[PDB]
Every structure is written in structure tokens, then in C-alpha cells.
């Protein structure tokens, strides 16, 4: 079989910008000239990018911008003006000619410290919870990063100043978020966990910062 690995995933305010990338391996010659897609939870599967000249579609014309690399097996996708419609798990290319873990991205529509972590088998049922100076009016848009120690930074849940929730498809159904109104702070679920999901976690990503970052692994 051929490899796909998508990386870049950020949850990022309107009108921001992205860089999506997709490192790829395999039995066959070094470049293949193919594109992008993606999925948020209220639509299906969507072409994105790719294609014999390049084609995007017109709900993201003018802003999504394809790219490739020859030395380093990547290619790119530069995402201008991101919008609440932008908000999806990318995913990079059909496995041959008919496949990644796909991405999550997401974009808002409007001293730091967590809690938790630890050690589980056969998996679920946890308190993650991210919390710093709680009482004036610091309630932004907000998710849980992990980072195993090879691969790199993957996106797993949001929030933001709203109860709307949105998942990367290595999680989906198995992580699960919320955030309560009196104590300020954001809860993730971690059910079902899997030897895959042993990482260390972070609930921060862009400026006005980083976390603390809590080691949570599964070994049994």
C-alpha cells in the first residue's frame, strides 16, 4: 500500500490563515501530482484541491492556494481567509486511483495551566481539564492539542465561546468535549482510549501561551 500523513491542523479566528501539509510514501515513483479534500460533520466527503491543470471549487476559489515539493515528498495548501464554513477534517488523496488520518481544522465563530493525565487500560471515562485565570471574562476559543514524540502537533477537540463541538476523525466518537459555565474551565471525555493515543496534551494554540502539557499513556 501507499501512505498519507496530514499535518497543520489549527483552530484559527476568521479571516486567518493556514498551511495545510501531507507527507506521502510508497511503492511506486517519487511524485504523484494529486490534490486535496475535506469533511465537516453537517456535509460529506468534498474535493478541495488537486487536478490535468489545477481546479478548486467556488466556495473556496481565490482563497485556498495548492503547492508542491519535489526534495521532501509534501504537498502544501495555503488557506487565506478562513471561514465558519472552513471548519473540517482534510484529508489529502484517494489511497491509489479509487489514505490519511485526516487533519481537523477549525475556525471560530467567536499563564496557562491544565489538569489531568495518567495512565489507562482498557480506556474511558477521564477528566482532562484545562483551567487558568478563570474569573475575568477569559473564555476563548480554545481545543485540545496531543503530540506523540515523533509526529507532530494533531488536534483532536474545540470549543470556543460558544457549546459547539467538532472532532478529528482518529477520535471521533471516542473523545468527547464540554466546558462548564460557572467554573470556567473545558473537559475532555478521553473514552475508549487506544495505544495510538498516548501522548502528552495542550489546550492552546495562537496569540493574544502554551500550556503546561499533561502525559496521558495506555500500555496494559
Known amino acids: 500500500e501507499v501512505q498519507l500523513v496530514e499535518s497543520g491542523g489549527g483552530l484559527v479566528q476568521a479571516g486567518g490563515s493556514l498551511r495545510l501539509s501531507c507527507a506521502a510514501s510508497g511503492s511506486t515513483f517519487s511524485l504523484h501530482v494529486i490534490g486535496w479534500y475535506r469533511q465537516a460533520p453537517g456535509e460529506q466527503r468534498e474535493m478541495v484541491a488537486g487536478f490535468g491543470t489545477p481546479y478548486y471549487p467556488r466556495s473556496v476559489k481565490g482563497r485556498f492556494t495548492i503547492s508542491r515539493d519535489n526534495a521532501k515528498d509534501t504537498v502544501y495548501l495555503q488557506m487565506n481567509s478562513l471561514k465558519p464554513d472552513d471548519t473540517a477534517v482534510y484529508y489529502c488523496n484517494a489511497a491509489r486511483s479509487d489514505w490519511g488520518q485526516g487533519t481537523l481544522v477549525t475556525v471560530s465563530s467567536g499563564q496557562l495551566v491544565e489538569s489531568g493525565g495518567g495512565l489507562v487500560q482498557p480506556g474511558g471515562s477521564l477528566r482532562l481539564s484545562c483551567a487558568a485565570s478563570?474569573?475575568?471574562?477569559?473564555?476563548?476559543?480554545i481545543g485540545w492539542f496531543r503530540q506523540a514524540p515523533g509526529k507532530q502537533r494533531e488536534l483532536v477537540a474545540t470549543?470556543?465561546?460558544?457549546?459547539?463541538?467538532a472532532y478529528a476523525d482518529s477520535v471521533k466518537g471516542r473523545f468527547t468535549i464540554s466546558r462548564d459555565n460557572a467554573v470556567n474551565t473545558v473537559n475532555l471525555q478521553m473514552n475508549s482510549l487506544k495505544p495510538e493515543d498516548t501522548a502528552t496534551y495542550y489546550c492552546?494554540?495562537?496569540?493574544?501561551?502554551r500550556g503546561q502539557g499533561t502525559l496521558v499513556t495506555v500500555s496494559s
Open positions: 478563570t474569573s475575568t471574562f477569559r473564555l476563548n476559543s
Open positions: 492552546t494554540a495562537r496569540v493574544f501561551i
Open positions: 470549543i470556543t465561546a460558544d457549546d459547539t463541538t
